[PDB]
Design a protein around this ligand. Structure first.
Ligand SMILES: [Zn+2]
Lengths: 397, 49, 397, 397
C-alpha cells in the first residue's frame, strides 16, 4: 500500500516535473527515485483483474534507465519518459481497480489482490517515497495505532431516516402530538407538533425531545443550528405507522421555546447550548440531543385566537422545528462527504465491471445501509478501498 | 558493470564517489560508496576541549 | 502558457522558500531555476494592456543573477530577492490580466495577448518548471488529447430555468395538471401537481416525468436525492404561459410514489434508482430523467377526505416533489462551482477595466447564457481564461 | 510565529519523507534542515501552560543529530527519527495550545505565551523554512503591509439576525406591511409582505428595500441569488416588537417584481443586477442592497380574486421573497466558514481547559457576538490565534 502510493506519487511528479526545457536541478532528485523504481520493478511479472468483467492483464517490466546527463531536458528525454510513465500509469490504474473491487470479512486491512500482495514484499520496499496525502498519512498512523483525523466538509454521518413518532394518537387522527424528523447527509430537521397547542398541558408547555445517536465519534464540528425546520412546515398527508390509513398535517409555526442542544459522549454532556442559534461548535460527541418545547402564546391578537379553540376541531396545528447542519467535522474513521469523490470512484469501479455482491459491502454499495450497520470489519474494508481510490484519483483524473 | 569510463571534469562540485553513488545499480558497492561520501567526524566537546 | 505557469510557480516558491535565516540546501534547487529565469528574461521587452481601461505598460528586464554563496540566507539576499520577485510578480499580474481579457472565435486555445504570444517561443522554453496544479495538468493533457477531469464541488451545470408545464389546463385554471421545476446551480427541484388528485385517472395514479438534458457529460457524481421539493410546497400565484392572467396554487403534499431516477448517456440507461433516497451515485451521464407518480390514497381519515372531493371545487391541490442536488462531480470540460473563485476573478478583471463585449462571451459574462449555449469555441476560450485565472490566483491572492 | 510554522513544517515533512526504505536523495535536503533545527534547539529550556487547567510543562532539548550516511533509510534511522519527532511534536502541540489560549487588548499581533516570545529571537531564526500555507503567507504579507486574501467557501460574514420591520402596523395586526429577514452564515433570506396586496398603493406597486451592511469588505464573491425565500413562506405566529402580543402571518407568494440587487462600496454602486437570478458575481463590496417590489396582479382568475378583497378581512397575505447565498468569497480579514475547522479548534482548546473570559474575545467564543462587534484589535487576535490553529492543525490531526 505504501509502495503503491509511492509509485503513484512518482508518476504524478514525473508527469509534472519532467517537462520540456526544464532545468536538470529541478528534477535531479526525482530521476534518481524513478530510476530506483525502474531498477526495482524490472524482472517482475504481475497479473491484474479476474473478477466480474474486469479483464485479466499480464504486466512485464523491461525498461531502460533514464539519462542523468542533460542540463535542460530536451524533447527526446520527455518522449521516452512519457512512454515509461504511460506504461506504469496503466499498470497502477489496473492494480488500483483490482484492489478497490475486492474485500474480505476476515482481515480487510490486508491487501486482497495478487499484485498488491506481491508489492508488499521488502524487495519492493525501496520504491517507497514521501507519504504526504491525507489518506496515506492516516494509513501510516493507524498502521502504528496512533490518533488520526479525516477532515470532512458536510460528512454523510446520518443514514437516511425520514419518519415520525406519535406521542398522542387515535384512529381519528384529529388530535395528535409528537415529533417528525429528517436525518439526511449532515442535516437533521426535526419538528414537534401538537394539535391542541398545549391547551391542556401543564403550564401550557409541551416538551419535545429528539435523540440522534451517531455511529462514529465526531470531533471539532462546526454546526449551523437554525430554528424553524422548513420541510415540516407545509400541509401534507402522511401514511400511518402500520401503513393502513393516511392523516392530514396542516401546520402553523411557533418559534421554539427553550431550545437545549446537548452533545453527548458516552452519556456525558460535553457541550450544551441553551437558546443559542447561528453557528455553534461541538468539540467531541457521538450523540446529539435536541430538547425544544412548544409554549402556547398567552397573548394573542384576534387573527391568532381563531386558530386555536378550546374545543376539538383544530384546522391549524401547532408545529415547532429545528434544523442542525454539520458543516465540517473531523472524524477518526472514514466517511463520505460533499467534498471528496472517493465513494463515487469506488461505486463507479464496482458498477462499471458488473461485480457480484460480496460478504462485507451492501448490494449496490448502498451508503445508507453501509452507515446504518457500520461494523469495524466494514470500516477496515472501507478505509482500505478509499485509500486505494485516493491513489487512483491522484493518477487517473 | 560495463559502464562508461566517466569523463570527470576537474571542478565538479561532487566527487567521483558522489556520482558513483547514483550511477551504480548495485546496493552493496553503492552502500559502501555512500558511507565514504558523507563520512565525517562528530564535533564533540568532552572535558572542555 | 506553460512558461507563464512556470514563472508564477517559481515566484510563488521564491516568496515561500527564500526567507530570512533559512538553510541554503532548502533553496539550492530553486535559486538555479530562478537564475535560469533571469538569464532567459534579460534583454527582452514586453507590452501589456491596451484594451478597455487596462493601461499600456512596457516591461524591460535588466537584473543581476542570484549567485552569492551563502549557508544561511541573510537579509541582504532576502531584500534583493524581494525586489526582483516584486517586479516579476507585477509583470506576470499584468500579463494574466492582459490574457484573461481577450478572446477569439477562430482558435480560442491559442494565446491572444502580445506578451503571451511572445512567451510561446522556444527561447523562453527553458523557463519551464513543474506543472503540478490541476488546471495546468489538464492543460498539458488536453494539449496531447488525453482524458482529463476537473473535480467540482456543487458544479454550476444547470442554467437558471424556473418554469412549469400544464399537461391539463383551461382558462378557468381550477383543474390543472402538470410539472413545475427549478433548475439552479447544481439543484433540481421538481414537483408534479394534480388538482383532482387522480380522481379520474386510471387506477388513481397520475404519471409525471421530468427530463433534464445536460450540456457536458458528468462523471462519478455523488447526488443527494430527497423527496418533497420544498420550494413548490407553499401557496403562490403564478402568471400564465402567455403572461396574460395569473392562477393560484394551494398545495398539499403527498409523498412521491414509485420514484425512478435514470441517468442517461446517449439515450442508454447507465444508472437507475427505484424508490431509493439519500445519497446516490451516477457514474457517467449527460441526461437526468426523474419519473415519479402521484397515487391517490385509498384509505383516508375524515381530516383528509374533506380535502379531495369528487366534484369540481378543489381548494387543496395534490402536489408531489423531488429534490436532486449534485454535491460533487468530475467533468471533462471547465465549469463553475461553489469551491473555486476563478469565474469571479475573470468577471472582476472584465468588469474592473470596462471591457467591451466581444464575439464569444455573453455580455456581462452571464453564466446562465454561457452554459445555455456552451459551444466548443466558448469552451476553449473559457478553459484558457480559467487557466490564466488559476495562474494569477496563485500569484495574486 | 515564522519559526513555529517552520518547526511544524519540518516535523510534518519528516513524518512524511523520512520513512523506511526510502532513498537518501529524497530526504537529503530535509535532514540538513532537521539537523539545523536540533543544533538550534539544544541547550534551551521552555515552559508551556499555566492558564486555566492547561498544565505547566517544562521542555528540555538534548538530542543527537541524525545520520547522513545511508543510501536507503533503514528502520534504525526511522525509529530514532520517530522518537525525536514525537518529542518535538508534543512540544509544538503544547506551544500552540499555550498561544491560542492567550490574548491581549494592547497589541494582539504580538506573541503572548512565554515560549513563543522566546522563539521570536534571532538565535532561533535559523530554524526558518518555507512558508507555503495560506495563513503563514498572509501572515508574512501583512507583516510587511501588503494586500492579502483569504479564500472562504460560504463565509460566516453575517451575524445571526432574525427579525422584522413593520412599515404599516396597528394593535389589531390585521393590515400590516413591511419586511422580514434572516441573516445567517452566508445566507440572507428576505421577504416583504403586504396584507392589502397594494390595493391602495399608487399604481398597485409597493416598494420594499433591505440594506445589509457588512463588517469587512468582501472581494470577488460568487453569489447564488434566487427568488421566493422559503423560510418566510408558511403561516406562523410572531411576537410583536415589544414582545407583548403575537400576530398571525398567512402568506401567499407572488414573484418578486423589479429586483435590483446593488453591491455598495463606500456608498458607491460597484455592481448592480436588475431582474437577474441564478449565479451572480460581486467584485468588491461591503454593503448589499436588495430592492424588490410587490405588484398586484392586474388579471386574476376566480381562484385568485377571492384571496384579495377590497375590504378589510385578509385571510391570505401577499408575500414576496428573495434568497442571497454567498458561495465563496475572498476577504482580507480572517473569518469562519464551512470549509476550515480553525474556529472549531480554537473553541475546542478554550473549552477543554476551562479558560476564563478575557478582555477581547466574547464569553464562550460566541461568533455572533464576535462578528457583530469586529474591532481591529479583535481582528488581530483572531488572525493570530487562527494562524496558530492552522499550525497545530498541520501537526495535530
Ligand atoms: Zn460546499
Amino acid at each position: 500500500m505504501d509502495v503503491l502510493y509511492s509509485l503513484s506519487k512518482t508518476l504524478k511528479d514525473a508527469r509534472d516535473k519532467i517537462v520540456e526545457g526544464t532545468l536538470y536541478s529541478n528534477v535531479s532528485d526525482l530521476i534518481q527515485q524513478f530510476n530506483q523504481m525502474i531498477i526495482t520493478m524490472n524482472g517482475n511479472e504481475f497479473q491484474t483483474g479476474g473478477i466480474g468483467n474486469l479483464p485479466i492483464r499480464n504486466w512485464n517490466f523491461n525498461f531502460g534507465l533514464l539519462g542523468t546527463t542533460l542540463l535542460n531536458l530536451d524533447a527526446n528525454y520527455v518522449e521516452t519518459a512519457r512512454n515509461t510513465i504511460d506504461y506504469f500509469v496503466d499498470f497502477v490504474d489496473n492494480v488500483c481497480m483490482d484492489e478497490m473491487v475486492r474485500e474480505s470479512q476476515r482481515n480487510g486491512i490486508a491487501p486482497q489482490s495478487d499484485s498488491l500482495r506481491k508489492l508488499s514484499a521488502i524487495k519492493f520496499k525501496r520504491i517507497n517515497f514521501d507519504n504526504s496525502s491525507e489518506y496515506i498519512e492516516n494509513w501510516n498512523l493507524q498502521n502504528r495505532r496512533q490518533r488520526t483525523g479525516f477532515t470532512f466538509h458536510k460528512p454523510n454521518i446520518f443514514p437516511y431516516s425520514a419518519s415520525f413518532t406519535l406521542n398522542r394518537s387515535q384512529p381519528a387522527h384529529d388530535n395528535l402530538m409528537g415529533t417528525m424528523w429528517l436525518n439526511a447527509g449532515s442535516e437533521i430537521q426535526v419538528a414537534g407538533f401538537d394539535y391542541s397547542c398545549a391547551i391542556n398541558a401543564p403550564a401550557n408547555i409541551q416538551q419535545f425531545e429528539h435523540i440522534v445517536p451517531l455511529r462514529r465519534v465526531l470531533t471539532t464540528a462546526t454546526i449551523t443550528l437554525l430554528p424553524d425546520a422548513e420541510r415540516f412546515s407545509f400541509p401534507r398527508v402522511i401514511n400511518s405507522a402500520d401503513g393502513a390509513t393516511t392523516w392530514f398535517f396542516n401546520p402553523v409555526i411557533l418559534r421554539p421555546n427553550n431550545v437545549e442542544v446537548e452533545f453527548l459522549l458516552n452519556g456525558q454532556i460535553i457541550n450544551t447550548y441553551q437558546a443559542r442559534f447561528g453557528t455553534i461548535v461541538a468539540r467531541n460527541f457521538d450523540t446529539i440531543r435536541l430538547s425544544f418545547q412548544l409554549m402556547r402564546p398567552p397573548n394573542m391578537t384576534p387573527a391568532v385566537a381563531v386558530l386555536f379553540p378550546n374545543a376539538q376541531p383544530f384546522e391549524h396545528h401547532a408545529t415547532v422545528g429545528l434544523t442542525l447542519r454539520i458543516e465540517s467535522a473531523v472524524c477518526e474513521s472514514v466517511l463520505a462527504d460533499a467534498s471528496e469523490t472517493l465513494l463515487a470512484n469506488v461505486t463507479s469501479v464496482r458498477q462499471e465491471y458488473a461485480i457480484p455482491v460480496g460478504p462485507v459491502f451492501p448490494p449496490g454499495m448502498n451508503w445508507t445501509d453501509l452507515i446504518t450497520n457500520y461494523s469495524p470489519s466494514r470500516e477496515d474494508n472501507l478505509q482500505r478501498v478509499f485509500t486505494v481510490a485516493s491513489i487512483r484519483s491522484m493518477l487517473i483524473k | 558493470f560495463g559502464m562508461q569510463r566517466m569523463h570527470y571534469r576537474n571542478g565538479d562540485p561532487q566527487t567521483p564517489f558522489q556520482i558513483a553513488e547514483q550511477q551504480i545499480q548495485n546496493f552493496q558497492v553503492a552502500n559502501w560508496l555512500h558511507f565514504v561520501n558523507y563520512n565525517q567526524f562528530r564535533q564533540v566537546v568532552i572535558d572542555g576541549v
